[PDB]
Structure formats: structure tokens, C-alpha cells
Design a protein around this ligand. Structure first.
Ligand SMILES: CCCCCCCCCCCCCC(=O)SCCNC(=O)CCNC(=O)[C@H](O)C(C)(C)COP(=O)(O)OP(=O)(O)OC[C@H]1O[C@@H](n2cnc3c(N)ncnc32)[C@H](O)[C@@H]1OP(=O)(O)O
Ligand SMILES: O=C(Cc1ccc(F)cc1)Nc1cc([C@H]2CN(C(=O)C[C@H](O)Cc3ccc(Cl)cc3)C[C@@H]2CO)ccc1Cl
Ligand SMILES: [Mg+2]
Length: 411
């Protein structure tokens, strides 16, 4: 059934997955020395390309490939339109490896045809807590703790094959060449997410959306007026009323994050993420990179009364193309990013997120049910969307966990 994934070091069935009790590798340990020096052979009409992310033109080429060919919703009404500034931020964290950005171009004109990207991430990915309890009961605590230390691995994103090249098994070649490049740096695990079912996820979660401009959402058919609203004389006016927000934040102390907050946000964030089974470990340079505000891309606010950062939240922006509306070209969506609350309840912190996003002209706020995102879905009037996001490892055996035990946000 899976000619490519059946040759790879991943759990092959949910049964396979059910028998996993400890984290650790799937494969045979290998060395850099064992891995072929040369790129994987490709058809003579194509060529491998490593784009330079410091070069405006190379970012622009990847931006056009994704603008026209990347992920669409299931009804083909919307397609993600990551900006060039977003791609530079996502693709180039501190100590990124330029060789992990893998492209295929057509030789005859240098047209970009396929892309995949890897970035370094440091991830806690040891045995989950529930499985450590079961281990203690069996007397098997040392095996359970072997891979407890944060690991330097690759996070894969942005796999995209041009529409004209679909179903020609081009995706497997990209994945194998990315794997070769990552392995040649002595990294043997990757983490990736997808909104498709592949062999075989370690967690799965629903998407959630919070309307901020319901009249536009209904006009572009992101949203429907629900049936229940028909009992009203003016269904749309009641819908707008239901989702209305304050103009200004409720928490005094709220202000944009600035560089001097980095150490305190790193502290409160790392203390929070600690509670989760799978989650990233960020250095000060990484906190700086992923959280300091960047126009049009990432927005971060802290709660500081009496000169101490006690809470913060962040969100990032991705516009989507609206495929053929006379009125609207773009859906401007905000995505919940990392956050930590130590002094106020999380629903009150995220309410300020929604108020900030609405004030800045976003149409909808989106999130996956990771972190503690469930604790605020009802009060903050989030609705479950369609389908599920699945989380995967490459070359890592891992027990199934709940999405509330996952703390890695994928951009
Ligand atoms: C240690 C280092 C390791 C680093 C690598 C780690 C692994 C990283 C894995 C990648 C993580 C990506 C994370 C993201 O970015 S998820 C976002 C993926 N991108 C899109 O959905 C954008 C639109 N779609 C496309 O561009 C194409 O349809 C893609 C590229 C998805 C497939 O192109 P195409 O339609 O032309 O298909 P094909 O004939 O070439 O190939 C068919 C084979 O590909 C398998 N397939 C289909 N969809 C996915 C998918 N989303 N992840 C993994 N595999 C997928 C499929 O099951 C089949 O295998 P098998 O069933 O025959 O066995
Ligand atoms: O925005 C939507 C709805 C939507 C689907 C398709 C569209 F064209 C526009 C909107 N879904 C949605 C998507 C995400 C994030 C999940 N996500 C990933 O897991 C990264 C993956 O490597 C690629 C991927 C991209 C998009 C999706 Cl939907 C699923 C997988 C990127 C997405 C943006 O950061 C987080 C929360 C929600 Cl509600
Ligand atoms: Mg193909």
C-alpha cells in the first residue's frame, strides 16, 4: 500500500505502534562515513539546488512555488500564502544549516519544481510520563530513561511539488535526499507534521478557529451562518454580536515584548514546556529569533507589572489566497504560537491575544489542540475545524500520546 513509506524507518501500523513502550531509534546506528557523498541520482532533465536564504531572489522563488502549489483546504477554496519575510524567519533560525534546504529545478530554465526544508531543533522526546509509570511498575525505569536528554534533530516543513509534477514519485526523492543531507551532519531523527494520514503518527489533534471578522468569513465561505441562527430576524447581526471583542486589552501591564525580556520569557516558557512529553528546548538566541516581534510575521506581548515578566503570548500571521472571490483576495489569519501564564488564568491571557489580533485587522485566529489550548476553547468561542493534524517522527520509536502532551508548534 505504501511503496515508499514501507522502506523507511518508521512504525508501519498502529499495531506496531501499540507495542512501543520506550522511546528510541528504529534503525541500526550508522556513521556519517557510511552515507554516500554524492547527491541521490535524479532524472537528467532536473538538477538539485540549494537556495541561499540570505538572497532576496532565492527567497522569492520559493515564495512563488509555495504561493501557487502549497497546501489548500479540502474544498480548494483557500491556499496558504506564506510571505517572503515569513519564509526567511522560518527557514533561518540561529545555526540553521543551509544544506538542509533542498530544491529541484528544471535545468532548461532553472524553474523551481520541488522544495523541502529542514531546520535544527532541540527536542525533548524521551519516554512519555504515562509509559514511565508503567515502566516503574515493571521494574524497567532505566531503559525508559535512556533517551531523556534533549536531542539535536531536524524539523521538516514546506514539502511542495509543483502541480504539473504531481504523482510522479518526486516527493520520495526529495525526502531521501533531505534525509541524506541531514544524516551527513550526524543527525538521525526528524519530526514533521501533516494533515494527511501516513505511517504512523505519535499524536493527532483537531484544528480550532475563532472568528474575529465573521461577516468577511461568511462572504469568502470560510464559515457558514449556522442553521440555529435562522430563528433570528437578522442572522448576520446576531453572528457579529456573538464574536465581538473589546477594542483594547483588559490586562494592564500588557505591552509588546522587547529584547530585554528574552531571559525572563525563556525562563517562564521553559518552565511551562517542561510539563509536556514532547517539546522544544530554546536557547536565548532561539527565544530571540522565534519570539521577538517582526512586522507582518510574529507578534509577542508580555504581561509585566512591577518590572517582572509574569505572562506572555505570541501569534504569527499567514495569509491565505482566496481562490476566486469578487470581493476578497486574502484571508488574514493569526495562529496561536507559544505562551505561558504564571499569574493569570490562561483564558484571560488568550482573550488579550484575540483582542490584539482583532485590533490589528486579522480575520480569524487558528490553533491545534496541543499545549493547554483545550482549556480555553469553550470560553473563547473557538470551534473545531475539519480533519486533524498528525505528528510524526522519522527514526524514532515512540508510544502514542495525547495532543495535550505535545508542545512543539509547527509553522
Ligand atoms: C533524519 C532526517 C530525515 C528527514 C526526512 C523526514 C521525513 C519528512 C517527511 C515529509 C514531511 C512533510 C511535512 C509537510 O511539509 S506536510 C505538507 C505537504 N505539502 C503539501 O501538502 C503541499 C501540496 N502537495 C504537494 O506538494 C504534493 O502532493 C506532495 C509533495 C505532498 C506529494 O507529492 P505527490 O502528490 O506528487 O506524491 P508523489 O507521487 O511524489 O509521492 C507519493 C508518496 O508521498 C507520500 N506523501 C504524500 N503526502 C505526503 C506528505 N505530506 N508527507 C510525506 N509523504 C507524503 C505518499 O504517501 C506516497 O508514498 P507511498 O505511500 O507511495 O509510500
Ligand atoms: O489554517 C488552517 C485552515 C486552512 C487550511 C488550508 C488553507 F489554505 C488555509 C487555511 N489550518 C491550520 C493549520 C495550522 C498549522 C499546521 N501546520 C503544520 O503542521 C506544518 C506542516 O508541515 C504542513 C501543514 C500545513 C498546513 C496544514 Cl492545514 C497541515 C500541515 C502549518 C499550519 C500553519 O502554521 C494550524 C492551525 C490551523 Cl486551523
Ligand atoms: Mg511527483
Amino acid at each position: 500500500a505504501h511503496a515508499f513509506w514501507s522502506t523507511q524507518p518508521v512504525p508501519q501500523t498502529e499495531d506496531e505502534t501499540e507495542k512501543i513502550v520506550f522511546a528510541g531509534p528504529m534503525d541500526e546506528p550508522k556513521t556519517v562515513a557510511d552515507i554516500p557523498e554524492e547527491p541521490y541520482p535524479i532524472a537528467s532533465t532536473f538538477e538539485w539546488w540549494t537556495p541561499n536564504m540570505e538572497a532576496a531572489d532565492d527567497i522569492h522563488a520559493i515564495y512563488e512555488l509555495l504561493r501557487d502549489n502549497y497546501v489548500e483546504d479540502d474544498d480548494s477554496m483557500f491556499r496558504f500564502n506564506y510571505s517572503e519575510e515569513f519564509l526567511q524567519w522560518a527557514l533561518c533560525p540561529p545555526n540553521y544549516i543551509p544544506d538542509w534546504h533542498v530544491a529541484v529545478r528544471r535545468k532548461a530554465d532553472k524553474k523551481l519544481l520541488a522544495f523541502i526544508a529542514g531546520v535544527p531543533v532541540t527536542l525533548r522526546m524521551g519516554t512519555p510520563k504515562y509509559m514511565k509509570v508503567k515502566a516503574q511498575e515493571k521494574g524497567e525505569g532505566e531503559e525508559a530513561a535512556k533517551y531523556d536528554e534533549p536531542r539535536h534533530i531536524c524539523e521538516i516543513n514546506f514539502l511542495c511539488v509543483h502541480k504539473q509534477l504531481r504523482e510522479k514519485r518526486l516527493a520520495p526523492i526529495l525526502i531521501k535526499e533531505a534525509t541524506r543531507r541531514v544524516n551527513r551532519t550526524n543527525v538521525w531523527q526528524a519530526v514533521y507534521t501533516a494533515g494527511v494520514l501516513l505511517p504512523t503518527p505519535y499524536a493527532s489533534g483537531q484544528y480550532f478557529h475563532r472568528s474575529l471578522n465573521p461577516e468577511k468569513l461568511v462572504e469568502i465561505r470560510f464559515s457558514g451562518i449556522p442553521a440555529q441562527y435562522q430563528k433570528f430576524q437578522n442572522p448576520m447581526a446576531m453572528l457579529k454580536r456573538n464574536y465581538q471583542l473589546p477594542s483594547a486589552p483588559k490586562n494592564s501591564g500588557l505591552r509588546e515584548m522587547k529584547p530585554s525580556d528574552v531571559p525572563q520569557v525563556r525562563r517562564i516558557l521553559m518552565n511551562y514546556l517542561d510539563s509536556f512529553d514532547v517539546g522544544p528546548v530554546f536557547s536565548d538566541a532561539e527565544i530571540s529569533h522565534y519570539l521577538l516581534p517582526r512586522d507582518g510575521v510574529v507578534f509577542t506581548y508580555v504581561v509585566e507589572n512591577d518590572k517582572k515578566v509574569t505572562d506572555f503570548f505570541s501569534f504569527y500571521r499567514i495569509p491565505s489566497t482566496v481562490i476566486g472571490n469578487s470581493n476578497y483576495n486574502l484571508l488574514n489569519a493569526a495562529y496561536v504560537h507559544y505562551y505561558a501564564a504564571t499569574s493569570i488564568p490562561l483564558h484571560q491571557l488568550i482573550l488579550d491575544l484575540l483582542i490584539v489580533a482583532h485590533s490589528r485587522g486579522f480575520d480569524v485566529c487558528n490553533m491545534v489542540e496541543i499545549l493547554d489550548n483545550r482549556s480555553f476553547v469553550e470560553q473563547l468561542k473557538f470551534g473545531a475545524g475539519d480533519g486533524h493534524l498528525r505528528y510524526y517522527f522519522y527514526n524514532w520509536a515512540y508510544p502514542k500520546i495525547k495532543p495535550s502532551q505535545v508542545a512543539l508548534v509547527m509553522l
